[PDB]
Design a protein around this ligand. Structure first.
Ligand code: NAD
Ligand code: NAD
Lengths: 329, 329
């Protein structure tokens, strides 16, 4: 643990392919320059035992028909069942179940802290829990929260916490979040400001995609928007994938040509089929410890961390030694 | 069968709900006025043993990932797996699978003839097989086939056969149909005239959906387009549903509020789990035998059928006896 984990991370750093090393090098540089923006989704919140969306679709399904579905719900059944419930049963009944499920208090997993350990310029989450807001407040990093159209102009600070999928701050109702099918069908007409505010950060910042699946609605919509741009014209987003099985090569080639630079979590380490907290932690600790220069051991590498900090100080003819402990950390 | 079927259909009609009776009467009136259009899907081709699309999505999966998938493909897999196989293995292999799977010759089931016996003014189909074209040709009905943009202007007849999903007439290649995921995204740009033609036919005619699942992709786009329209302004399409299990009440209310009048084939008879032909023929025979006046069993209907034919002739001073045999057929 104390020694095992420290040795394991440094050992895994030496076996990584050049692609993962380049991805980590770019992520660390973006974080140091101050242009790193995380994109948290469902998966960084379920580590805090937050309910998954299918557990509410099942409740809607068994309150409409009478029995849970015999299988896993598809992408259409995630938006169509709650819409059938809203149309048939009504709106107050649709909000009673939301109040029952989402009126819970849960802790903040360590990942929520690690995301704040890299100093992200912004944070773009597509979930409605206040776990990330609580973590940011407790760690002392003030972030202006933007969960409504009226919040875009009234931004007190410069760092954002854009919740592009609504929020339950104003109350536990379905008019503040995007859950049904018609909510997605009218997202660009009901949220015209948070769409621009999200598409601008993606184009003028480094983006990471922790906590997301590789076939989500949001990821595919973002890739559809990205394909409408020109030749390169922007930085390809990084995608931390933490699924149990290793990613197939065909599906990796298919997605790496659409913009993603995938960093699979179940390839640097071997873990159990349910140890998700130890798959997020591998990538996050790899990035954080790459920031701290722990994974630096070579003769030519010390002539880069030394030249890369002394070379700018060449126009000056004689710099003081009292502040020379500032050009280095 | 031979003689019991005539009594069984009459009993079913006598034991029908009033909504289905009204739907059948309106359908018969539309057929008699020449304003009936049939929307045929990929459920009248499987009666001819035509290869279902999930077999191609299974061959693509087997050739990509080496082994078949576990379970049943969702909506996204129906459009993404073919797209991944395209982007990875090339258009040549994509079309090689298409030619090997779709270059077959199947007969025309009795439903293709019951469809034509109702005398439709148009036929809109999302399948690519030429089964409906063969059925039209082998009965003396001339329909102008329309499966590409260049065919819209070069039409010669007034009765269209609008294949709104393409056709393999000009070669068994994937560029002549809509099968992938990017084909569906760029459909309004690649088929701007066929969409307008289909929308105009839907607006100015009576539509019956036969062969489509209720949660189909195509149906849920027409249902979204038909909501952007104003108040009533048109006629709600008829949907002939022939699934093995009866439709639930909530899902019936959900789709009847979206502008659909549903005729459930699994609620008018008692068929087996795989007796799809006996359910198609149970709803396509009620309409045809209602046209033939096999259900008139009251004096208020015999003094009305005669009156609807004879009343317009009251203007004429005297009609010949060889025209009374023309007024009635
Ligand atoms: N889809 C259904 O109807 C259904 C039915 C029964 C059970 N489940 C279970 O719900 C879980 C999520 O299913 P999904 O369809 O959203 O796949 P998903 O990959 O789209 O889930 C999103 C991401 O959540 C992340 N994550 C972090 N901790 C997790 C945890 N304990 N469990 C799951 N994900 C975690 C993962 O990185 C995952 O990629 C799965 O464990 C699944 O077995 C789903
Ligand atoms: N639903 C899936 O994703 C899936 C996946 C793998 C295999 N399958 C198999 O394919 C069959 C149909 O799958 P689908 O994707 O077309 O969904 P679906 O059942 O909704 O098919 C659409 C329509 O085909 C009509 N039809 C007429 N004859 C039919 C026949 N012999 N078999 C099936 N439908 C007939 C049905 O009335 C239906 O409305 C299923 O019975 C199953 O054995 C389905």
């Amino acid at each position: 643990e104390s020694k095992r984990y420290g040795e394991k991370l440094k050992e895994v750093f030496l076996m990584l392919d050049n692609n993962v090393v380049e991805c980590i090098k770019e992520i660390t540089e973006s974080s140091r320059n101050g242009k790193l923006v995380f994109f948290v989704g469902a998966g960084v919140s379920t580590l805090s035992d937050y309910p998954q969306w299918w557990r509410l679709v099942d409740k809607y399904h068994e309150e409409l028909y009478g029995s849970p579905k015999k299988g896993n719900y598809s992408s259409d059944e995630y938006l169509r069942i709650p819409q059938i419930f809203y149309n048939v049963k009504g709106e107050m009944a649709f909000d009673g179940i939301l109040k029952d499920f989402f009126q819970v208090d849960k802790p903040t997993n360590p990942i929520h802290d690690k995301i704040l350990a890299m100093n992200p310029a912004h944070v773009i989450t597509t979930n409605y829990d206040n776990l990330i807001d609580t973590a940011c407040w407790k760690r002392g990093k003030y972030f202006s929260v933007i969960s409504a159209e009226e919040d875009v102009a009234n931004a007190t600070s410069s760092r954002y916490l854009l919740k592009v999928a609504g929020d339950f701050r104003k109350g536990f109702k379905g008019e503040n979040v995007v859950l049904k099918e018609d909510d997605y069908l009218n997202y660009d007409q009901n949220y015209p400001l948070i769409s621009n505010l999200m598409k601008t950060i993606i184009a003028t910042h480094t983006i990471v995609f922790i906590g997301y699946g590789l076939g989500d609605y949001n990821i595919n919509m973002l890739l559809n928007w990205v394909r409408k741009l020109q030749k390169d014209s922007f930085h390809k987003p990084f995608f931390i994938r933490t699924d149990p099985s290793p990613i197939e090569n065909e599906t990796l080639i298919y997605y790496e040509n659409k913009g993603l630079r995938i960093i699979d979590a179940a390839s640097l380490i071997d873990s159990n089929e349910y140890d998700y907290l130890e798959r997020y932690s591998a990538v996050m600790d790899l990035l954080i410890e790459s920031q701290e220069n722990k994974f630096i051991t070579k003769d030519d590498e010390v002539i880069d961390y030394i030249y890369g900090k002394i070379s700018p100080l060449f126009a000056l003819q004689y710099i003081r030694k009292i502040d020379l402990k500032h050009v280095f950390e």
